[PDB]
């Protein structure tokens, strides 16, 4: 056991490096930029997970299944956080900032953009804090959603409980009423559940784009996509 403040500071220092992706958009080139970006981020995501304390003490199978299960949710919550103070824009990366209307370039993606933007808008209205963001991204990894994946399982429960306790502690510092602290926690958790659903949609869409030969999918992103 770390303190909740020690835990949150470990999550801060775990944060991955930022990545850059690098003609006007076609369906093809937009998906190329987005898939290129996702693949680079995935590399850093594994290193990030390894810095979440306890994560590397889990069985390797659990480590693998946790990342196969949550990687798209983690990409998406990162995106929402980068975008939180810019209504109508998705800040995918520096030099890849997309207006809502640019979803019209890719078949099916505008529905997903709007869901990502609406979720980002709820985080903005909630005034999601830096400390809360760190906790929720870690909770997503550690299977707050409880997707069905003894010692590794017991450890995992401990780790998720610790990050939940830290989020509760962060919320308590806000000084708002106990009733409002409970409602805030429920709202954040129901938002995580929504991100899971957007992730399922995203996965579907990417598998469709791959199938229709709209975009090639290589390497780590291919590996992670092959698991769904």
């Amino acid at each position: 056991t770390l303190s909740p403040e020690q835990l949150v500071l470990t999550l801060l220092e775990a944060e991955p490096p930022n990545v850059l992706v690098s003609m006007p958009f076609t369906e093809a080139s937009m998906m190329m930029s987005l898939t290129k970006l996702a693949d680079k981020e995935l590399v850093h995501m594994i290193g990030w997970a390894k810095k979440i304390p306890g994560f590397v003490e889990l069985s390797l199978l659990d480590q693998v299944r946790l990342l196969e299960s949550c990687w798209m949710e983690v990409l998406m919550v990162g995106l929402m956080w980068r975008s939180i103070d810019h209504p109508g824009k998705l800040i995918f990366a520096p030099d890849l900032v997309l207006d809502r209307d640019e979803g019209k370039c890719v078949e099916g993606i505008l529905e997903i953009f709007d869901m990502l933007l609406a979720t980002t808008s709820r985080f903005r209205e909630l005034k999601l804090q830096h400390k809360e963001y760190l906790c929720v991204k870690a909770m997503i990894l550690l299977n707050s959603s409880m997707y069905p994946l003894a010692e590794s399982s017991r450890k995992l429960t401990h780790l998720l409980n610790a990050v939940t306790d830290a989020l509760v502690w962060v919320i308590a510092k806000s000084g708002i009423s106990s009733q409002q602290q409970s409602v805030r926690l429920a709202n954040l958790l129901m938002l995580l559940s929504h991100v899971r659903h957007i992730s399922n949609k995203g996965m579907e869409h990417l598998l469709s784009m791959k199938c229709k030969n709209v975009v090639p999918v290589y390497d780590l992103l291919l590996e992670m996509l092959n698991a769904h």
């Binding site: 590399v43 594994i46 290193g47 390894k50 390797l60 480590q63 693998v64 990342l67 196969e68 390497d219 780590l220 590996e223 992670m224």
Partner: peptide, 11 residues
Amino acid sequence: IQSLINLLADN
């Protein structure tokens, strides 16, 4: 080029 398990195991 580097896979999930290699990324998890190494460094």
